[PDB]
């Protein structure tokens, strides 16, 4: 059971949307978690249970997707919303997670 | 502990005050099935066993 | 919540460190914790579990035999232990929660800070 | 009505609507059928006073 | 009761129990119609006698 993130660096400007994906090697449910890690902090996590955010996250991050296919959806952030992404899972022992994916503009 | 499915536990029901609310918005639960009777009404009607 | 981990440095190869987190808020009891190391310049990969008493601990790749976590809730801490080290394993190190025993638990998650650990 | 809501009490209620009418059309037949028995025996009255 | 297990072999005998009933129905209604019209023939034959 191993996360992977397949989209590479991308280059969105401040604006428009970015949708990022996230698999997995077998059939995980409502148990994916999402982290944003900037240059040398700590992974601030992101959505509960792949549907509800957690406090301090605004509105505009929004979690979805099922079955082994999971997506990140960013529908207009700002001016300085661009790091590291990661998914993670608590099915099973241990939490994998995964690769992770930058952006750059 | 719980038991095993070959020999499952069974525990009866006396005079009481049963509640069903609490129970049911603790948001925990992987299946909250009611079939013959709604999840709000436990509330309010009384039973025999 | 809150979680607060100390222990770090420099080191040698082949000694010992007290990788210890505190915690307090929430109940450390009823409630499973991990480890978790980042070498500066990677992602992130997990080390090992403890499972709310210690019965059931399990281990990461090469890191089975050099590391031994243990929890104590009657002084609501943990530990890794760290011991005869390599130097290919400086990295930072985070203690978080897996989450949930009972059915009244109410799963939240919370990470640490971290802790770095230097060898020579 | 008190165990079950709107979406699934109406399955149940329609099936005692459906009986209970046709229970009350059947009684209506026999009282028409009846009624016209005893109009001849009073048309047979009236013509023997 | 052959191709059907008990949980879906009662839906499809109350279709059969139905269609039956309302046609044993309108056979019982029909007669009682027919009768009634026998009845007043008679009555005419008994007084023609």
């Known amino acids: 059971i191993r996360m992977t993130q397949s989209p590479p660096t991308l280059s969105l400007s401040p604006g428009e949307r970015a949708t990022l994906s996230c698999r997995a090697s077998?059939?995980?449910?409502?148990?994916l978690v999402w982290y944003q890690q900037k240059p040398g902090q700590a992974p601030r996590l992101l959505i509960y249970?792949?549907?509800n955010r957690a406090t301090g996250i605004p509105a505009r991050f929004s979690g979805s997707g099922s079955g082994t296919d999971f997506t990140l959806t960013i529908s207009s952030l700002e001016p300085e919303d661009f790091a590291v992404y990661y998914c993670?899972?608590?099915?099973?022992?241990?939490?994998?997670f995964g690769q992770g994916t930058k952006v750059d503009i | 502990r719980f038991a095993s499915v070959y020999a499952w536990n069974r525990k009866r029901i006396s005079n009481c005050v049963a509640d069903y609310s609490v129970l049911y918005n603790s948001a925990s639960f992987s299946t909250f099935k009611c079939y013959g009777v709604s999840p709000t009404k436990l509330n309010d009607l009384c039973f025999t066993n | 919540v809150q979680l607060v981990e100390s222990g770090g440095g420099v080191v040698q190869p082949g000694t010992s460190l007290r990788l210890s987190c505190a915690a307090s808020?929430?109940?450390?009891?009823?409630?499973?914790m991990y480890w978790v190391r980042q070498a500066p310049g990677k992602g992130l990969d997990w080390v090992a579990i403890?499972?709310?008493?210690?019965?059931?601990?399990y281990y990461a790749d090469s890191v089975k035999g050099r590391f031994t976590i243990s929890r104590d809730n009657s002084k609501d801490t943990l530990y890794l232990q760290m011991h005869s080290l390599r130097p290919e394993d400086t990295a930072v190190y985070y203690c978080?929660?897996?989450?949930?025993?009972?059915?009244?638990?109410?799963?939240?998650?919370?990470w640490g800070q971290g802790t770095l650990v230097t060898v020579s | 009505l008190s165990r079950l809501d709107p979406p699934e009490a109406e399955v149940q209620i329609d099936r005692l609507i459906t009986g209970r009418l046709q229970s009350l059309q059947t009684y209506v037949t026999q009282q028409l059928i009846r009624a016209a028995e005893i109009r001849a025996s009073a048309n047979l009255a009236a013509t023997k006073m | 009761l052959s191709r059907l297990d008990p949980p879906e072999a009662e839906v499809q005998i109350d279709r059969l129990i139905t269609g039956r009933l309302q046609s044993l129905q309108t056979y019982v209604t029909q007669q009682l119609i027919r009768a009634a019209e026998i009845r007043a023939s008679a009555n005419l034959a008994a007084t023609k006698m």
């Open positions: 403890i499972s709310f008493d210690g019965s059931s601990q």
């Open positions: 077998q059939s995980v449910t409502n148990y």
């Open positions: 249970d792949t549907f």
């Open positions: 978080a929660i897996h989450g949930g025993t009972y059915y009244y638990d109410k799963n939240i998650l919370a």
């Open positions: 993670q899972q608590r099915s099973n022992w241990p939490p994998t």
């Open positions: 808020g929430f109940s450390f009891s009823h409630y499973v």
